[PDB]
Structure formats: C-alpha cells, structure tokens
Amino acid sequence: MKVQYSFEREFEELMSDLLSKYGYEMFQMDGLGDQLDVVKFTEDFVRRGVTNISTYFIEISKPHTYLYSLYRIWQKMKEMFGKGVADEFVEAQINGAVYLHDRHHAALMPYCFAYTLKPIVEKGLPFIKTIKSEPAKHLSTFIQHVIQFVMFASNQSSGAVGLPDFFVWMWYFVKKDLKEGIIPRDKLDWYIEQHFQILTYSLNQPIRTTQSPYTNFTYLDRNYIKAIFEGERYPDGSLITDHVEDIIALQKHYWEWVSRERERQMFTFPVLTASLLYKDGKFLDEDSARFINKINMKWQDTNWYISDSIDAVASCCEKLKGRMNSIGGSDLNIGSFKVITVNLPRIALESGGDREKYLQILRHRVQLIKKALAAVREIIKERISEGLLPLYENGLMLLNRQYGTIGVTGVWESASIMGLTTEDIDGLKYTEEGEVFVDNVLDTIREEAEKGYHEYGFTFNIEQVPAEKAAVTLAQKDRFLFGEKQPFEIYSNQWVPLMANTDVLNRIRYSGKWDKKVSGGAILHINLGESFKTEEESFNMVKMIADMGVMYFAFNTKISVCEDGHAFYGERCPVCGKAKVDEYMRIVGYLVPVSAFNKER
Amino acid sequence: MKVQYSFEREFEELMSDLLSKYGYEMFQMDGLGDQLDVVKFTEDFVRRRVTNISTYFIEISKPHTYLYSLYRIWQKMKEMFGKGVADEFVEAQINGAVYLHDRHHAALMPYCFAYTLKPIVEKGLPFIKTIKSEPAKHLSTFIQHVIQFVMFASNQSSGAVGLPDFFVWMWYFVKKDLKEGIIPRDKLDWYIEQHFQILTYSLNQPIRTTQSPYTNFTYLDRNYIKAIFEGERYPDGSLITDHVEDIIALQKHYWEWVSRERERQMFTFPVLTASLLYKDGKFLDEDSARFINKINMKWQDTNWYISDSIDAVASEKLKGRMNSIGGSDLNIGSFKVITVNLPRIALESGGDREKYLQILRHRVQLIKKALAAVREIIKERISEGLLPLYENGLMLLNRQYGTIGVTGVWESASIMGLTTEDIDGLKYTEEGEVFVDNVLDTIREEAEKGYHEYGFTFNIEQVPAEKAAVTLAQKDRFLFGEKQPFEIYSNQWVPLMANTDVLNRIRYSGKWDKKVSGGAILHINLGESFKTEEESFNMVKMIADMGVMYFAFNTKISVCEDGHAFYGERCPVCGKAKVDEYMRIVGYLVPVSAFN
C-alpha cells in the first residue's frame, strides 16, 4: 500500500534531487528509509526481546514527526531568507555537516529550563486546566506538587528539568509544620528523611518507557542565597535572607542522606552540583567548600561549579547573561530553546589540511546555523499563540531567558586529521601550532555568536555538547562519504578525549584557556591514578584546579554494582556476597551504568 | 510523496476490492482516509484552549497502529480458520456490521482488570525493573505505591483500573502506624483525611493528555468481606476477618469525606459503587444499606450493585460479574470487546424475524473466531516479554472473558415495526418483548457453546458505546438512506429520554438483566428531590424486588467558573453564575458541554 504525505512541489523536487545525489543508504543512515514503514518497524520491534509495550507507542511515530519538522523548518527558512538558504540547510542536515538535536520534536516543543518554585508555592498547579488545585499548606502536599510539576514539564520539553532553589522552599514547610505541632520534635529528623525518600524514589521509577525524566539539584552557597534572594519574602511575610543558616543545614542533611542511601540502592537522579564563589586564591564560603570536599570522598557523586562573580545571578528573579550547561549547574531562570551542532571533522576533511580554507568554511556554516535557529524560534512563538504550551502562559518558562545554542563536537579528531596532535612521556597533546589552531576556531565562533544579537534580536551561546548519539552518527556518515581518510569510530566530547592519558597539568591548562571562551559550556574529568590518601590532599588539589581557571569539573571514580543493585568497590558485594555485574562512571558528564549506556549510544 | 507499507499480496488485493465496492467515503468514516496523511493531520490538529502539545504525540499514530492491528488479526484468523473467514471479518469491521473496541491497541495490549493489592503490599513494584523497590513500611509510602501502580497499569491496558479491596489494605497501615507511635490517638482522623486528599487529587490531575485514567472504588458489605477473606492473614500474622468492623468504619469515613469535598471542588474519579447481598425481600447487611441510602441523598454519586449469592466471589468455566462502568468483582476482567450492530440486521432483514435470527447467529459465530485470534496474539506478546503485569501475577489470563457486545436494541425493534405508544407512554409491543427474549437467548446459547469450542469463557454486555453509538448510525445512513432515521443508537433497554413510565423501565430491566448476567445499567432522571429517607429506601427495595442488578438516580449538578458544586443558577460559595452541569450520561458523572 502506498500512502500520501502532502508536500509542496519544490520540497518533493529537492528530496528527489538529494536521493539522486547521495543514494538510498544516506537516507537510511539519517532515519528516513525503511523506518517509515510501520509494518517492518513493528515486526522488528516485537522480536528484539527490559523493554515493555509502553515503549512501542512512543517510538513508532518518531520518523514521521522528524519528517514533518524538517519540512516545517524548510518552509519557514524559505519565507525568511529565500529558497537557496533553505535548500542548503536541508542538504547539510541529511548529509551530516550539521546535527539538529531532538529532531523528532523540533517543530513542536522547546529544549530546556532551570526553574524557580515560587509560582508553584503561590498558585499551585494552574497549567492543569480541567480542575482547580489549591496552593499547598503542609510539607506532604508540597512534595506531591513538586513531583507532579516534574512529570508535567518533562512532556512539554525535550531536555533537563532543573530545580536549583528546591531547599529554599522546602525549609518554609518544615518550619511551619514544626511550629504548628503537626510534626513532634522527637520525630523531626524521621519525617524529613521519609520525604527525601518519597521524592528521590519517584524520580527514579519510570512509568512509561525505561528511562526517568532528567532532573538536576544544586547546593547554593551562602553568597548565592544572599545575592539571589535579597529583598524577597516567604508567604508568612518573613525575609528569606533571615533564614540562610537553616537553609544551609537542610542542604547538608540531604547530601549526607543520599551518600548513605547508595549502599542500599544505586540510582542516577537527581544529578548533583555545588555552586561556589572563589576569588584571588580563596573560597568566600569556606565552611561549605570544606563540607562538599568531605562528603565527596565516599563516591565522588557531586560536580564542582566555580565562579568569580555573582553579578549575573543578582538580577534573575536585554542581552542575556547567566550560565547554560546541558549536564548541570545552569543558573536559576536560564535555559535554551534549541541546540544545533557543527561537525568539525567534516570541515577538516573538506579543507585538505589548509587552515585558512578551514576557517572560511567554518565562518559560513556558523552563519547558516544562526538562520536555522531564528526560524525554529519563530515556530515556537506560533505554538505559544495557538495555546499549545501552557508553561509559557503561566510564567514558569520565559522565552526572553532562553538562548539559541551553537554546538561543537570532535575538536580533537579535527586537529588530528589536520596533522596537529602528538604524544610524549606525559601522554597525548596538541602541537604548538595546534593550540593556536584551537584558539582561532573558538575565537571565530564567538565573533559570530556576538553579532547575532544585533542581527536577529535574541542572544546566542556556545556549548561543547554531551553528544550521546551525535558522536557516533556523525563519524559514521563521514566514513560513508570519505572512507579510510576518517579513521575514528566515535568523536570526543572534552578538549582531550575522556580516556586519554594526558598529564593532569596539561589537561587543567587547556581547560584554563578554553572554558572561558564558551562561558562555562563544558566539563573536565580529572585523571587521578590511585584514590585520594587524605582529606587535606583532596582539598589542596581542588584549590589548585580552581586557581588555574577551570569552570566545571569532577574526579574519576569507578563504582561497582551487584544484580540486586547494592553499590560498592571491588568484585564482591559486602551486603549480599554476589559478584559485580556492571559499573557506574561518567561517560558524558553524569554517573551511568556503562554497558547499558554504551549500548544505547 | 508516497510512502510504502509492506503487506502480503492477498491482503493488498482485499483492501483494493473493498475500496472498489464501498468508495473512499466509507474509509474516511472508519478512520482510514486522510487521517493517515501526517501533514494534513498535524496542520488540522494545531489550529483548533483545553488540549496541549502532550495530546499531539498520543493521537498522531492511532490511525497507523489500527491499520497494523487489522492486518495482524487478519493473518492470525487466516492461519487458524482459513482465508474466507479472515476476509469476512475485515469486510464487516470496515463496513460497520461489527465494532472492534480500542481498535488502535487491539494487536498490542489487553482491555481491563479489577485487581487485589495483596502483591503490592507484599512485594512492592517488581514490574519496574531498572531499580529494586522495597515493600511499604508506613501509610505515606503505601499511598505512593498505589498511585504509581495505577499510572503504570493505565499504560499497559486500554480500559478501567479497578481497586475493590483498597480499604482492607489501607486499614493495616493505619493499625501499624498507630501501634508504632508514628501518630497519636487524638490526631488520627486528621492524618487519615490528609492521605484521602493526596490520593484523590492525584487521580484527577492529568500529566499527559487532558483526561485522567478511568478508576473504580467498591464499598464491600460485611457479607462480601467475610466471604472473600475467610482464613486470610495480614503481614503481622493476624486474621483479616477479626477486623471487619474497622474496615467498615474506614469505608464509611471515605464516603462521608468525598461527599463534603465536592462543594470545594467537583471531580469524576474514582467512580463509586456499593455491593450488597439481598435475599427474600431483605438486605442481609441492613446497617450498610441504610448508610449508603443516607449518604446518597446529597449528590446521588454512588451506583447500587444487588446480588443474591456470594458463592462466585467465595473463591474451569469462569463465573463472576463483569461490567465496563463499575462493580466488576475482585479478580475479574475482559481481554477484548467486539460489538454486533443490531439496527444493521433489522435493515438487512426487511422486517422478517426468522431471517433476522439466522443472520444474528452467523454474525456471533464470526465474532467468537475473531476473539479467539486476539487471545492467541496476546499470548505471543506475553512470551516476547512485553506485558509484565502477567509475569508478576497482577493480571491473570484465565480470569479474563472474551466479550460479545450489543447496541441499538430499541432502534432495531423500531425499524422492525415492534414498538408503540399508549397511555403509559412509549413501549415494546407484546410480540416485540418475545422478539427481544429470542435475540438475547440466541446470543447466550452461542456464548455457552464457546467454552467447549475454544477453551476459554465468553460473556455479554450492553456497552456504554460512547463513540460507537454515533459512528454505527452514520455508516448505516450512508448505506441505507432515509430507511435509517436515527442520529444516534441507545445504550439502555428503553432510551433514557423517552417518555416511558418508570414502572415499564423497571419491568424491562427486571426481565433482561439476568440474561446478560448483570452486564447493563438502569439510571433514572429525578424530577424534584426526595422528601424523606424512608421513601427513598422503599423505592430502592422495590427496584431490588423486581430483579434489577445495577442502577442509579440522576440529579443535575451545577458548577461555576471556579469549580464549586451546587444546585440552581447561583453559587453559595462565591456568588458567581452557573456555567456548566455534571450528569450521568453513560453511567458515570461528567461535565455535559464537554461530552460532545
């Protein structure tokens, strides 16, 4: 049976011309071949047996909503910029010169946001319109509302649901219920922990599919609490800044509880970050920094965020400032509506090793990505006007607080193809001409991101993206097109590859030079041979790393699990005595089970 | 642009022949026309506010998964019974002689079940395999697991999630938390009501799409509690039956709380039923019956279930009540319903009743063969590892019926010339009553033969037919023109809005409910309001005496823009005017403007 999809004549002509030029195999690699045949797709899915039937109904329509989104983006770009520019983008997306993230969602909903819970506390759940819900009056109903909000928001967006001020609002309800005698003192710590447990297990127990929503928590230091909440009041009229020491103590209690709970059961969410202010050789909140250094000795389960100023966060709750990162540590009231990534190894292959030629091609392709992002933003505005995205109508997601993102991947592999990498006793490194080359690539992307605000009327950022699927897909398309000239099976997501032996001093130096050029849109893994021998050792090393200008980092760890999910180190579980079956490590910046995750890439 | 869907040659040929015979309009009416064009469907969806983007991703693939399910059911019928039979079933589904329920899910997952919570209390959530969960130790974590269970089960099935023994298990956690000093004796009622509030609001606040899952609660009388749980024990070793009076008291407390909560905010779920044993003119638990009668006076929000025996629930041919609205017995369900269009057969017969009865018997025999094929496909999916509620002992396949549905009994009779009107109002003729007797007796003869033919048990239901009642009438008008004068077909023995006298309605239900073993509902519109409890209770007894098995009374409930429930034109809470009304249309209370 042949079934019709109704496209304009010009788009049919383009798709036919591209099939002529590249062949059916190119379409098959991009997800637009036999995946569109519902019968073949279904009979393959049911025979692959972990997965249950709820996954089928989510996956079956993804090729069809991708095809729709690519058509709608072509239509809009043709209207804004002309037919030639539109045709150029569709060709670049199908052949792999660029990568459109969340492509099955791209003409329908936005990427991510880091939320404040103030509207939830004051107004309840106003975005659910079939019933009127009253604002919470006690701790149990506050916790219920937080869970419902996370689940709602994860089906109105493709990426992370961030909650950096969670502990600020939880403290209010703890104190209220204590003063009222709802919670007796002799039961206060029991009560707090039982709510920690309900929230945490809910965020790791998937109802549909086999994966939970992606969530983030942040430990806010005393400087951050004070700068963000100056002037603001709780619903009882008291000043939030009058309660800083109680908020700090509730944050410390959660971090201690979760470190103990991992022996009983290992889990991924929420992803943990600590945000610290550091200047001229010292931490401005030294008590919090020493605390995080102490608790991390067990599992290294928390990522370090370091900043030298709180100016950007003072004014959060026209050019946009504030940190945006897809792993964790995005500032309160900041997000991104869409990411589109440039394939850097492709440009290396096209240039023949001529660096001036490389920089010309790069500048043109970044200009193309800006016009595609502008068109996607116009489509999101349409959806808001059509009544389809209530998080925007109700003041939770804010469009004027979201960037358009220019992504990068394969920096190392690109330099390697150009002839600009080497090795010595201290491991893999860039040549002297290589460090200059990377300087020039990032400075050039930055120039164009800045010009965009005056060109298009909104703000652009740059990220070295996690690239969970793109790192594999881009390398495969390049090998299809260029053969043995492209010798890598996967591209890298850090300045030096995750599993390279590069001296710690060189690694730290490189992140010191280049994190600032992407305004904190990256992460560094520190390669420590042997575990830390003492607390003071660890702390001296943290201070060294911060001194050199690294903005976001985490220490290496390899955590074992048994078949019943207990976490430990070594080959035999100390709880039940069974052998290890897998291990948890950071592959794209957060702790995951490695065999399953690597299969999923 | 054209996209290929890869079918066997014989199915391709069949679909081409049916398009030639009936034309593209018949395919459009069945959902297999321009609904399959992704671009048209998307641009139509987005320009229509109640719905949001989460609805789009659920609706876009339904035409495609229906087309796949129709093909797979054809393949399995061909394997089991030959190509002629498989071809006949497809023609009947496309042209409206039959109606396959939940058609977009029919080769992927099953319809419904009424669960016990024993395995949840004893094992936690083992059907979620990516993390290991421990059984609940306290009331708050028990409430959490019940919510998570309902949401998980609603995405592994198409129809209702029933929880008839909820209060038996909630009581154990109340008792344990009292014994362990978690909550003092004097703050007990406040603690209980906080948990009623969390559970109830979660079951009325949709996360994906704009509708919550369909859920049911049952008030079990003292007879039912004693018979179901004889010899059974709680996790602490004590006998369930030593606590009958505590369970009854906790059930009464919920029924009182939810009646008061409607003024604060009106909502639908869970749908409420009370199950009572009644024999030789008397309720055998009179205390509970009088309580239900008393509490119903305000909103008439509970449906009455009447039975004469507890033998079936006391424990290969399956016995136990199955109903799509509410009151399905503990550990009973259905894997699929396929409904017969009775007005079609009236139109095909030309008014000859022996011809009608011959066509009917053949069409029911075809429905049995299609149900048997669906069941074989469900067994395949269980062995592929796709349906974990069966592996984990929550859904049980030998406790599910295959269901033969009916709709349009009255309109069928009208077209045949067997209805009239007199001083009593609209009614069946004498010959018409005997005709309905014969139609129901024929269907039941074939339902009983199927056990020996196929090795599993069949039931009958007069279904709610929310969408089928409209689409089947439309298809018949397309094929027969002015000979089919009705805009919609009926889901009760006489139409709800007809002028029939109430004694007539009650008489028909008293005759015919027993023939479909309780798979029906009688609901009566109240004019004024009851003046006293005693008159209400005598009416309830009168209806029970006549043999009616499931019934309710209908009031007209007003709501304002802020959501408060009341009677009349102006709100006693906030002073604003009425903007809509809640009423019982197919068995459960819904906002009337939206039901459209």
Ligand SMILES: [Zn+2]
């Ligand atoms: Zn173990």
Ligand SMILES: [Zn+2]
């Ligand atoms: Zn009102």
